[PDB]
Design a protein around this ligand. Structure first.
Ligand code: AG2
Ligand code: CA
Length: 343
């Protein structure tokens, strides 16, 4: 008799405009849907406990770090009859963080690559600018030429150091402290005078408006920037590269806090997300690949056929995933990132 409620916490710009409304119309459940613009906000609230959320959207990486902390509770697959729709390849990658896929429902995934302005890069570096390579943004001679049109990096040491280590021919997940303080920091300090800022969201609208011409960014965010520029009929042409040397893949997942009050409603929402049209519609709006293999044909051609959103087998084989480091490396990385950004 009483109203059924559900509290969700997700990234901004990571659902379709009508997803929640459609769910409410179909199920009668009241949804309170809150958003963050950085996962540091989510992670800080989960670690503090008693969030009031029934569903949250962490990284598979963070989820691994909190598996022993009891932040999350295992998902009851009997309430998720469309679980069979999830792509088995992605389930296996997520399971590196969540054995036997016990706690997390893969949601969307993408890569950390290069977002850029096509016209500005070709004006500055020529028609043969190496947009297919990390050389575009990790060679100082190129960044010096791009300095004035604006360069940004993510403010994310784990991802940036891993990208740098892969580029140098080191283990992207090296456990050697000297790899970070030595060769990775050396390259970063060479590049640093040419970097306008380190920020993990300002780069989206700056790419869309023409204010930055190259950025390390998350694929779907860059594709959103490209679409925003198109809708603004502003002439700006943004693209994204998964470079030929490889790149980091990441997997955002739905998970259920251990103190969730509205569990039946949360399962209804997850099984709704597993219906192929629901997550295909989300992908159509947010320009991220969903993790549902049944959904892929339903995604619009512009999105499904974009190999920087849905990469093919050869590109997938070049992606690496982040591993959890020992605390001693975590601290070396954080210390070194502060040095890089300082100067
Ligand atoms: N960095 C992640 N793990 N996800 C980024 C998602 C952003 C959706 N607007
Ligand atoms: Ca991840």
């Amino acid at each position: 008799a009483e109203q059924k409620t559900l509290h969700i916490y997700n990234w901004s710009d990571y659902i379709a405009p009508d997803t929640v409304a459609n769910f409410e119309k179909e199920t009668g459940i009241k949804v309170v849907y809150d958003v963050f613009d950085s996962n540091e906000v989510l992670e800080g609230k989960l670690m503090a406990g008693s969030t009031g959320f029934d569903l949250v959207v962490p990284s598979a990486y963070f989820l691994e770090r909190q598996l022993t902390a009891g932040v999350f509770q295992p998902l009851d697959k009997s309430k998720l009859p469309e679980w069979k729709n999830l792509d088995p390849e992605l389930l296996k990658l997520v399971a590196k963080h969540d054995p036997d896929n016990k706690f997390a429902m893969p949601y969307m995934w993408a890569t950390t690559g290069i977002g850029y302005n096509v016209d500005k890069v070709k004006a500055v570096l020529g028609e043969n600018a190496p947009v297919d390579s990390w050389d575009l943004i990790l060679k100082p001679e190129n960044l010096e030429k791009l300095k004035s049109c604006g360069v940004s990096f993510l403010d994310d040491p784990e991802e940036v150091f891993a990208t740098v280590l892969n580029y140098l021919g080191k283990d992207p997940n090296s456990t050697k402290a000297d790899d970070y303080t030595g060769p990775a920091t050396d390259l970063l300090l060479k590049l640093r005078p040419n970097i306008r800022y380190f920020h993990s969201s300002q780069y989206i609208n700056d790419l869309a408006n023409g204010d930055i011409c190259v950025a390390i960014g998350w694929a779907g965010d860059v594709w959103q920037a490209s679409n925003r520029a198109k809708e603004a009929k502003n002439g700006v042409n943004v693209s994204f590269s998964i470079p030929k040397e490889g790149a980091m893949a990441f997997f955002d997942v739905f998970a259920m806090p251990a103190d969730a009050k509205n569990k039946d409603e949360a399962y209804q929402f997850l099984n709704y997300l597993l219906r192929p049209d629901v997550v295909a519609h989300i992908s159509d709006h947010v320009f991220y690949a969903n993790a549902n293999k049944a959904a892929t044909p339903l995604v619009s051609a512009e999105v499904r056929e974009n190999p920087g959103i849905y990469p093919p087998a050869d590109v997938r084989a070049k992606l690496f995933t982040l591993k959890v480091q020992d605390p001693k490396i975590d601290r070396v990385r954080t210390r070194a990132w502060t040095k890089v950004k300082s100067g």
